[PDB]
Design an enzyme around this catalytic site. Structure first.
Site, PDB file in Angstrom:
ATOM      1  N   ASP A   1      -1.488  13.872   9.542  1.00 31.02           N
ATOM      2  CA  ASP A   1      -0.047  13.631   9.423  1.00 31.02           C
ATOM      3  C   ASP A   1       0.641  13.174  10.756  1.00 31.02           C
ATOM      4  O   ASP A   1       1.494  12.296  10.763  1.00 31.02           O
ATOM      5  CB  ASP A   1       0.631  14.891   8.903  1.00 31.02           C
ATOM      6  CG  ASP A   1       0.322  15.165   7.474  1.00 31.02           C
ATOM      7  OD1 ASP A   1      -0.337  14.311   6.786  1.00 31.02           O
ATOM      8  OD2 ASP A   1       0.731  16.259   7.029  1.00 31.02           O
TER       9      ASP A   1
ATOM     10  N   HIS B   1      -3.780   6.741   6.764  1.00 31.44           N
ATOM     11  CA  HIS B   1      -3.459   8.115   6.422  1.00 31.44           C
ATOM     12  C   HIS B   1      -4.233   8.499   5.176  1.00 31.44           C
ATOM     13  O   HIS B   1      -4.686   9.592   5.048  1.00 31.44           O
ATOM     14  CB  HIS B   1      -1.939   8.257   6.206  1.00 31.44           C
ATOM     15  CG  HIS B   1      -1.487   9.662   5.983  1.00 31.44           C
ATOM     16  ND1 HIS B   1      -1.073  10.119   4.749  1.00 31.44           N
ATOM     17  CD2 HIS B   1      -1.436  10.728   6.824  1.00 31.44           C
ATOM     18  CE1 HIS B   1      -0.757  11.400   4.847  1.00 31.44           C
ATOM     19  NE2 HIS B   1      -0.963  11.795   6.094  1.00 31.44           N
ATOM     20  N   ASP B   2      -4.334   7.599   4.228  1.00 32.07           N
ATOM     21  CA  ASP B   2      -5.057   7.885   2.990  1.00 32.07           C
ATOM     22  C   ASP B   2      -6.534   8.097   3.336  1.00 32.07           C
ATOM     23  O   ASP B   2      -7.167   9.030   2.837  1.00 32.07           O
ATOM     24  CB  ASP B   2      -4.938   6.666   2.050  1.00 32.07           C
ATOM     25  CG  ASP B   2      -3.978   6.873   0.899  1.00 32.07           C
ATOM     26  OD1 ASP B   2      -3.193   7.831   0.908  1.00 32.07           O
ATOM     27  OD2 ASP B   2      -3.990   5.999   0.002  1.00 32.07           O
TER      28      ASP B   2
ATOM     29  N   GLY C   1       1.417   2.752  -4.220  1.00 33.75           N
ATOM     30  CA  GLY C   1       0.494   3.831  -4.535  1.00 33.75           C
ATOM     31  C   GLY C   1      -0.947   3.598  -4.142  1.00 33.75           C
ATOM     32  O   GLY C   1      -1.843   4.265  -4.660  1.00 33.75           O
TER      33      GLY C   1
ATOM     34  N   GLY D   1       4.018   1.612  -0.852  1.00 35.53           N
ATOM     35  CA  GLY D   1       4.987   1.592  -1.909  1.00 35.53           C
ATOM     36  C   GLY D   1       4.441   1.236  -3.263  1.00 35.53           C
ATOM     37  O   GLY D   1       5.186   1.204  -4.252  1.00 35.53           O
TER      38      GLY D   1
ATOM     39  N   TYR E   1       0.792  -1.188   0.000  1.00 43.29           N
ATOM     40  CA  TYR E   1       0.000   0.000   0.000  1.00 43.29           C
ATOM     41  C   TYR E   1       0.857   1.286   0.000  1.00 43.29           C
ATOM     42  O   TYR E   1       0.637   2.133  -0.866  1.00 43.29           O
ATOM     43  CB  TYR E   1      -1.024  -0.024   1.131  1.00 43.29           C
ATOM     44  CG  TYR E   1      -2.104   1.002   0.952  1.00 43.29           C
ATOM     45  CD1 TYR E   1      -3.368   0.650   0.500  1.00 43.29           C
ATOM     46  CD2 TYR E   1      -1.856   2.328   1.248  1.00 43.29           C
ATOM     47  CE1 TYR E   1      -4.340   1.603   0.325  1.00 43.29           C
ATOM     48  CE2 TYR E   1      -2.812   3.281   1.077  1.00 43.29           C
ATOM     49  CZ  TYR E   1      -4.062   2.920   0.627  1.00 43.29           C
ATOM     50  OH  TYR E   1      -5.003   3.912   0.487  1.00 43.29           O
TER      51      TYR E   1
END
Ligand code: CA
Ligand code: CA
Ligand code: CA
Ligand code: CA
Lengths: 122, 122
Positions: free
Chosen positions: A89, A47-48, A31, A29, A27
């Site tokens: 973040d 985070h996404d 994209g 690495g 996920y």
């Protein structure tokens, strides 16, 4: 913005985002196209997700205010979007740190071929 | 290895790979799936090409020797694979630097939707 996210990751993990986070697993690495392989890997998925909830914001380019003076990321004043981006973040950089114990060097630049399609949902 | 590539990029560009290079455009930032949008963006495609020619190497994980003492990346001793990996990495970091003049902040985190399928070949 992403540059602040980068600096948080560095400050919490003592590692730079590249190649340690940007190329990790299925996920982080790949994209977003594979099912997270482990916990570090899910941190990016969360985070996404946290970015997706901010329909009225520009989380990649909006610059917020934070302090890390005393070892802890403290999200400062700014607009409600800026605060909420900062919290997305912070939470991801903390997740990476909390999960250093299961961090596997092998998942760096993991071959995408072995990645399964996404299954969890935000 | 990728961590050395990272350090070369930083040393040549004065920028960290994330988010400045890892999220740029349609090839660097979309994992190789789109046609390079500009020159910075092609640098990553060329780098991917230079790695592809090294069928007998492990360019992501093999650690080479280089010096940057005097402002210039000097690839040092090591195996033929290590030397060749080092030269791929040097050449990409130099390409990014030579193309700072056309670097566009807008291509960072460029929406993949607008990316066209690959056209150039190594
Ligand atoms: Ca982990
Ligand atoms: Ca971690
Ligand atoms: Ca360029
Ligand atoms: Ca550049």
């Amino acid at each position: 913005d992403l540059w602040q996210f980068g600096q948080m990751i560095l400050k919490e993990t003592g590692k730079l985002p590249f190649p340690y986070y940007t190329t990790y697993g299925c996920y982080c690495g790949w994209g977003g196209q594979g099912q997270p392989k482990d916990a570090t890997d899910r941190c990016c998925f969360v985070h996404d997700c946290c970015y997706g909830k901010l329909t009225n914001c520009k989380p990649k380019t909006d610059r917020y205010s934070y302090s890390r003076e005393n070892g802890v990321i403290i999200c400062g004043e700014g607009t409600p979007c800026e605060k909420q981006i900062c919290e997305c973040d912070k939470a991801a950089a903390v997740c990476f740190r909390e999960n250093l114990r299961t961090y596997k060097k092998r998942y760096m630049a993991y071959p995408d071929v072995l990645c399964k399609k996404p299954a969890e949902k935000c």
